[PDB]
Design a protein around this motif. Structure first.
Motif, mmCIF file in Angstrom:
data_model
loop_
_atom_site.group_PDB
_atom_site.id
_atom_site.type_symbol
_atom_site.label_atom_id
_atom_site.label_comp_id
_atom_site.label_asym_id
_atom_site.label_seq_id
_atom_site.Cartn_x
_atom_site.Cartn_y
_atom_site.Cartn_z
ATOM 1 N N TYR A 1 0.844 -1.182 0.000
ATOM 2 C CA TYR A 1 0.000 0.000 0.000
ATOM 3 C C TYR A 1 0.886 1.240 0.000
ATOM 4 C CZ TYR A 1 0.952 1.960 4.548
ATOM 5 O OH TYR A 1 1.557 2.602 5.597
ATOM 6 N N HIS A 2 0.316 2.349 -0.460
ATOM 7 C CA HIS A 2 0.997 3.633 -0.498
ATOM 8 C C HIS A 2 -0.007 4.736 -0.176
ATOM 9 C CE1 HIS A 2 4.042 1.463 -3.096
ATOM 10 N NE2 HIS A 2 2.938 0.870 -3.511
ATOM 11 N N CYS B 1 4.979 9.492 -2.732
ATOM 12 C CA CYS B 1 4.364 8.633 -1.743
ATOM 13 C C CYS B 1 4.695 9.191 -0.369
ATOM 14 C CB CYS B 1 4.882 7.208 -1.885
ATOM 15 S SG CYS B 1 4.247 6.113 -0.608
ATOM 16 N N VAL C 1 4.260 7.484 2.577
ATOM 17 C CA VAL C 1 4.900 6.511 3.450
ATOM 18 C C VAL C 1 6.362 6.920 3.554
ATOM 19 C CG1 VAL C 1 5.786 4.182 3.534
ATOM 20 C CG2 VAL C 1 3.327 4.575 3.060
ATOM 21 N N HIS D 1 9.340 5.215 1.910
ATOM 22 C CA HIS D 1 9.123 5.250 0.462
ATOM 23 C C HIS D 1 9.534 6.595 -0.137
ATOM 24 C CE1 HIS D 1 5.845 1.835 0.572
ATOM 25 N NE2 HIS D 1 6.900 1.555 1.319
ATOM 26 N N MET E 1 10.569 7.469 -3.937
ATOM 27 C CA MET E 1 9.225 7.505 -4.510
ATOM 28 C C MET E 1 8.748 8.953 -4.539
ATOM 29 S SD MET E 1 6.875 4.156 -3.457
ATOM 30 C CE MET E 1 6.216 3.537 -5.000
HETATM 31 CU CU LIG Z 1 4.749 4.055 -1.303
#
Ligand SMILES: [Cu+2]
Ligand SMILES: [Ca+2]
Ligand SMILES: [Ca+2]
Ligand SMILES: [Cu+2]
Ligand SMILES: [Cu+2]
Ligand SMILES: [Cu+2]
Ligand SMILES: [Cu+2]
Ligand SMILES: [Cu+2]
Ligand SMILES: [Cu+2]
Ligand SMILES: [Cu+2]
Ligand SMILES: [Cu+2]
Ligand SMILES: [Cu+2]
Ligand SMILES: [Cu+2]
Ligand SMILES: [Cu+2]
Ligand SMILES: [Cu+2]
Ligand SMILES: [Cu+2]
Ligand SMILES: [Cu+2]
Ligand SMILES: [Cu+2]
Ligand SMILES: [Cu+2]
Ligand SMILES: [Cu+2]
Ligand SMILES: [Cu+2]
Ligand SMILES: [Cu+2]
Lengths: 278, 278, 278, 278, 277, 277
Positions: free
Chosen positions: F191-192, F249, F251, F254, F259
């Motif tokens: 998940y992100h 993202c 997170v 991440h 990301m």
């Molecule tokens: Cu992510």
């Protein structure tokens, strides 16, 4: 000093008690639980009767690595060797010397760096209890193993060391030349890499090479995962001197999180040159 | 206890790669009898093996082996054009060598050890699909005089599964107290793991057993492993601990909680396990 | 092959920390000649190296070494003012020592081994930013009598990259069948990896070569490692397997699929590589 | 109760970033009273806010807000040179705007909603360490006509913690039956979560309340959230269910097990809580 | 048809039994507990007294999402609403219609796709009892809600669908044009994404757009997490025809590891084109 | 610009091709495969015949989310709607307008932000083909939807964006005032949470409020899991100005692992203040 040969029947009282903040620890005297639990030391051949008492409202168990035990002292609900609330039970750990079997093989003795931990708090695998602080070191020494000036236990439990708040050590002090024993235990979900500045050990049973013929890698860094345990003995400040020698998990986010601590090595006069808590 | 002889034989087997139920794929020695893990391949150092391989599937597949000697034509990779097309056949050849002194005075490591083979082309150029689907199995190369076991059991941590089994379905393995039991431990996929056996321990070296009193190998009951690691060892079932349902599991706590557990069922001579309700 | 001499020389080298193209940082021995990984430093046990270091950047940097002897003044940390300021210079001193028997009767492990150095202050107080930018390099300390290689290559698994190179871009290394090739394997950052080489295998000990028939170290072609882990080995290129483009890669499946892969191009004497279409 | 008036005011406020106990860091509008979660900022659409920001720390820090209008100068990133060096100051300027009919025929979304601000440069260039230490707080932007609440409580899931509080220590909130209670729910860290509330439910829309019988938004008591998600709602405490100690917790089982739980202490008019004995 | 007004007092027995292989399920009659537990349907306004009985040797509880209950029926240990071994208790669930508060606000009704589950087995949050299978669906309909030809409950519980072993469905059968109701519950530790081939629904209370003024996103794929619940009704095969229409978690290792099932849609003549299990 | 009523029969050729570094992609012309694959836009009512060419050595498929398709265009091995190596197959996607059914309920139209991906490479759920790059976006527009100046597709696939190496964007450039369409798809295992600096959108079908009566939450941050898709339109720099507006993202690791990308909004002259690449 050196470890004697073993073969004594020993007896100790252990308690599982709740601590502040939802934590749980083992202790030898009651109200004296600690995280990590008390250091248990044995020489190969010794038997340990743990007279165990659960002072909590939830079941708890005591399960050990490496040492000999019968299924009745497994410490798991699956084998019905857990301890119901307010209950008591005698956990029996045995240990044995190495030796030559009749078939010609060599039996590995019990000696090594080991640990015990809960197996039933939270889940049938003790995930809550381990999280809560129910873990401790066990050293089993072989005849003639060199004894340290001090033993310090460092547990990587998830993103914490010894369940201490982040960035809070713990710190260990020595003086130059001390023979200092580290016991290293990992627990929970994550892998880690334990690193020590200024020092190094052999990747083998004792953390010390047996002599010029021991080919074990000499390291200052070692990957570990849950329920790994190893140990070693270093000479404090050897070839490097006094100082605030850092140790830490070397996974970058983990060290940034405060999975770090200090090996405070003092000169004989007591000076730690340059040491300056900010 | 039997001992392995000097190798040097030229051996030939058939192998098939086949689709199994539920999107799985396995190797097998006979058509229609693929398994996950695939068949155990045992060789003595010096042996040669010609694997007469046939891909019965609708996708290219390969056979890549760890540890043994093979020319690039037996790499089992797309970039060497050593994969096998849908319906195709190919002979893969593995060789092994004894250790010995080189003319330069250095010691050449032998092939002996715990090894494995797996797909390298299904889904990705590194066999990510094939490996997840079950295209892996154990390879044992013995050295002359290695102790032979009563039985061998293969335990593959593959992603969050054991041998591609649904969570909480073992596998379990049966022994009688005193049995010489060989474990081959393989890891595959995305995740690190730690293997733990209750009531039992082994030495962290080639054979899993100490050569004698001079071997400083750490004795362990817990070991961290990551994708494509392989190790193995032998234990005496129940030795010093007695009969019982002896748990083995990943010791990453959520992995054990999610079913990466199985039972080493050590029975009394009368076939019973005290305190185990099936 | 040649062998390493006994150490004991005082050696001096200059080092600089420069920004490199695209937000990366490197170590170099001359200004403008910084690399990622930084330059290889080779010592013999007993040598002393004075590194005369200059931070040519606009941000603080440090130089922390693993395994080697150093005083606290060369820890290379902000925590005790061993970091360097922008434009500043500092002399970091590294010492080494042979093994030998201590006065207390125990074997003191020598400094020989596969080590590394890296930044400890860029981004955070554990060099998270610095290491990610490329501030790392290898150190090899040889012991008297160690076999000397025909070539040394350093493979650093840094986060999801090899040697900070973009994914799917090697590096490749060339050699000729029969070459004695030395590999240095360093891991950094956040993730665990497993390093794997096709066609070749080594001993899991200090040198990567078995000392002779009494060394029980596992022989492996795959090894898990975590951030700040280092090891090394030597292999005879193509030994028992012949020429070809032999893959090395992380064996974590998503990691090899993202391009943490490279080639060990082993050449026939005529310079060719059978089966290698470039 | 009262209703939000139309906005359009230019507001000024001082904010300080400073350390707290245990490596923590917090925002405050007064020195020595910084808190986790940071202070609640409330605005009406059209209001402007000038945050005269002081960084009273030895590391750089910044202020980045969600949802609201701001230029690159108030982005609060190291990459847009909008961070605040150690001991520096800066005016962070946030703007807000009503909805409206644009020229091109479309409808322009207003700023109203449940938002938040957090650091963006401590530890990483994405504030990974800053957010971890507690540098986060809620911003409410109200639309003209929005129902005003008796009380607003902010709940932040920061990895395994609620508001950086030690495990199993709440926080709790007290209401009286009939109170209109507004909850702001923010999430930070690495993990997804599911915020759940016993005894109450709400509408999954801007305000948490159904606009009328035509509003088809799902009525829920549980929703999944992940890093940087923010939403809010209002409930009538005890509405249709009465007084009690109504639990709220993350519903990811391992998260609630480790003590991501608080209490909604809803008293009867006479101040009693039926069947709530500590 | 359509749902009528609520307001009736209903009563039901429910049992907490042990099942095969370390399971635990709820059921309306002794010996016939199911994983997932039985479907409870109510209309906004109804009351349900659940005459509960723990037939196990460990404590159990009944805790429900969405519906109205006094703290007496939280079904938690710290609120002493759990049930001892052998013990009985009445849990009482109430539902309410939406309406305008005196305060001038709009009070959200009880209508929705909800669920009930244990709160005590293994941990104070029912970790073991949920894992063991003690969960089940409750549907509260609003007056006028269209009724379906059938309802199928799909629970992602850790890496299982309905505690069934990997790659074992369940499958559901319909005929093209059937009005099929799906209730989707998530439990345990993992997030998931539920995906349905051949079909789509509205991300709102009923899973059907109220009309042209409903801006709700239309999806065939939704991320959920433990204790999430939602539902929808679809016309089987609408615009797509008969076929073995997969549903599965779309987390790739989950679907590879067996979190898959088949919505088997037949023609009137009974055929499923290309179905070949 | 505004989308017309659909109802055209459209035809396109799609190729699946191997690409460098072990990847695979879809392309509209031979030798031009790309990751993400080509953007397919349709108006509600359009039929699309995708004449598919598998140039690879492994079976491959085309599976579409959201749109109408018969089971023979499901794109799975299970009913043999994959494409053999070297082979061809015509996949047909249809799309319908919203309307009321005879049973009185509202049938939601096909309009939305959708996607297509492999379903048979590596596993029976396309885990290898997805990871290799076989994914692309589908937009179905409703009559009256406002047309953007540009559309950018951002696919979170495991720990990459668009299969690109970490920390390599991609960046998208616009000018202040541009009406910029973002299509966001997630694939793989994790998940992100997608976040965009200085901008925001409505959590609904179009990402834009229907008007003052639309209660959809206005967000700048959203959680997504494998096979989720959504999208929106924003006015580049509206109320906030030109600048290198980061999207990533959220997170934390991440974003720390790259990301991240840049929404480079230029002033009418073409410059971006504060931007020191
Ligand atoms: Cu992510
Ligand atoms: Ca060793
Ligand atoms: Ca909505
Ligand atoms: Cu154990
Ligand atoms: Cu265990
Ligand atoms: Cu760590
Ligand atoms: Cu254990
Ligand atoms: Cu390989
Ligand atoms: Cu595991
Ligand atoms: Cu391999
Ligand atoms: Cu350090
Ligand atoms: Cu890797
Ligand atoms: Cu270091
Ligand atoms: Cu950001
Ligand atoms: Cu949580
Ligand atoms: Cu609840
Ligand atoms: Cu942010
Ligand atoms: Cu609860
Ligand atoms: Cu799933
Ligand atoms: Cu619940
Ligand atoms: Cu599918
Ligand atoms: Cu899909």
């Amino acid at each position: 000093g050196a470890a004697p040969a073993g073969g004594e029947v020993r007896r100790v009282t252990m308690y599982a008690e709740r601590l502040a903040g939802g934590q749980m620890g083992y202790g030898l005297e009651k109200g004296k639980a600690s995280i990590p639990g008390p250091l248990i030391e044995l020489n190969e051949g010794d038997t340990l009767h743990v007279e165990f008492e659960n002072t909590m409202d939830v079941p708890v168990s005591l399960h050990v690595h490496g040492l000999d035990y019968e299924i009745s002292s497994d410490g798991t609900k699956q084998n019905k060797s857990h301890v119901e609330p307010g209950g008591t039970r005698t956990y029996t750990w045995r240990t044995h010397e190495p030796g030559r079997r009749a078939d010609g093989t060599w039996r590995a003795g019990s000696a090594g760096y080991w640990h015990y931990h809960d197996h039933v708090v939270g889940t049938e695998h003790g995930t809550g209890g381990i999280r809560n602080g129910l873990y401790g070191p066990v050293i089993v020494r072989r005849k003639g193993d060199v004894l340290p000036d001090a033993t310090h236990t460092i547990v990587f439990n998830d993103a914490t060391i010894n369940n201490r708040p982040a960035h809070t050590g713990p710190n260990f002090e020595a003086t130059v030349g001390d023979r200092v024993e580290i016991v290293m235990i990992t627990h929970g979900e994550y892998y880690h890499t334990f690193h020590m500045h200024g020092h190094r050990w052999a990747d083998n049973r004792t953390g010390m090479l047996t002599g010029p013929d021991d080919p074990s890698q000499v390291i200052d860094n070692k990957i570990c995962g849950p329920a790994n345990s190893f140990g070693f003995q270093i000479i404090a400040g050897e070839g490097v001197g006094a100082g605030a020698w850092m140790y830490h998990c070397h996974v970058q986010s983990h060290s940034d999180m405060g999975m770090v601590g200090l090996f405070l090595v003092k000169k004989p006069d007591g000076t730690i040159p340059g040491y300056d808590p900010q």
